[PDB]
Paper text:
KIF19A, a kinesin-8 sub-family member, is unique in that it possesses both functions, MT-based active motility toward the plus-end and MT depolymerizing activity. We recently reported that KIF19A functions as a MT-depolymerizing kinesin in the control of cilium length. Thus, to elucidate the molecular mechanism of the dual KIF19A functions, we performed crystal structure analysis of the mouse KIF19A motor domain as well as cryo-electron microscopy (cryo-EM) reconstruction of the KIF19A motor domain complexed with a MT. In the catalytic core of KIF19A, the KIF19A-specific feature of adopting two different interfaces for MTs and tubulins is utilized to achieve the dual functions.
Finally, we performed cryo-EM analysis of KIF19A in the nucleotide-free state complexed with a GDP-taxol MT. Cryo-EM reconstruction at a 7.0 Å resolution clarified the interactions between KIF19A specific structures and a straight MT. It should be noted that, presumably because of the weak or unstable interaction between KIF19A and a straight MT, stable and full decoration of KIF19A on the GDP-taxol MT was uncommon; the occupancy of KIF19A is thus lower than that of a tubulin-dimer in our reconstruction. Thus, we finally created an atomic model of KIF19A-free on a MT that has the similar L8 and switch II conformations as KIF5-free and the similar L2 conformation as KIF19A-ADP. The L8 of KIF19A-free on a MT moves to interact with H12 residues of β-tubulin during binding with the MT-lattice and the release of ADP from the catalytic core. This movement is accompanied by approximately 7 degree counter-clockwise rotation of the following helix α3, as also reported in kinesin-13. The switch II α4-L12-α5 of KIF19A-free is retracted to take a similar conformation to that of KIF5-free during MT-lattice binding and ADP release. The length, the location, and the angle of α4 in KIF5-free fit perfectly to the corresponding cryo-EM density of KIF19A-free. This means that KIF19A is able to adjust the switch II conformation to fit the straight tubulin interface on the MT-lattice. When KIF19A is on the MT-lattice, therefore, loop L2 interacts with α-tubulin through the hydrophobic tip and basic cluster, though the acidic cluster will not contribute to the interaction with the MT.
Numbering used by the authors: 11 to 211, 215 to 342
Amino acid sequence: QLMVALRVRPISVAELEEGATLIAHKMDEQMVVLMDPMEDPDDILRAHRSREKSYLFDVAFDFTATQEMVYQATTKSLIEGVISGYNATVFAYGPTGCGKTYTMLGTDHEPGIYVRTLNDLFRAIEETSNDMEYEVSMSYLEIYNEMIRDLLNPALGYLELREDSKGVIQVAGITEVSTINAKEIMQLLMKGNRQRTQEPTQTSSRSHAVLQVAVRQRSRVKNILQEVRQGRLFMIDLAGSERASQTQNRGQRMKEGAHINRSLLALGNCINALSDKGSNKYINYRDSKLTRLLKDSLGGNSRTVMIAHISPASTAFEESRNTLTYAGR
């Protein structure tokens, strides 16, 4: 069961100075159109065949939506399931500068999905600790060129995911920080983030940040057995696909693009399999990194939420068209 959202960030000053116009438009609460701008010395077109193309999503947002509104429309509903033992996943997807980190982390003035979700999580827990015992743990790490960082413990840089007795993949050694408040979770991500590989030339356009929250629930009634539940929420902020011909990436850079492109392909192969057929033959989780971690999650009785991001800027038309196509339902 998959949900796909598209977020349009407001246009930027840098874009206006480059001379960009608005070509992306929320038309509808779940429809976005993308105007084609134009540029000679062609076109042999007009003969347009658009001009304008439409795109539909489970939900859509532009600058009118607040942080809280995107939270409420994307991930709030996941919470009930997670504390009940079900698994869930939220991706921020899109090109660099289109909004991923803002949607997921937010700012002090404007908090994103991480904290709004952690918040309703702890309230949901209290509202039901009459009946239930709960344990909550969260971690915040980085995957950069298939190499982990933990974001906390400084001594590991190559963690390999291992299977338990029931074939469930899970990162081995991955630190696990106990968090008793929202102010602590934010500090952990801010203190650990600095570790996230940045642009050798700013964060690296190749850095996944994974926030994972684990929740164990058992009954307070002891004279009746009942299953002990364990839900796992993954909240992920990634980078963008790189056309290596452009950029002209070499060595550390050249190889860097090969990975990101590989991981995004793998991910695309996994979500495509989950969306369609069908036993299956087994959904290709074994494709690559970021997948080893998400293996036991993302399956039959688990939820996925993808939030695609674009610029509304004319100067971004090609990227936006790729994004809209990819996420387009």
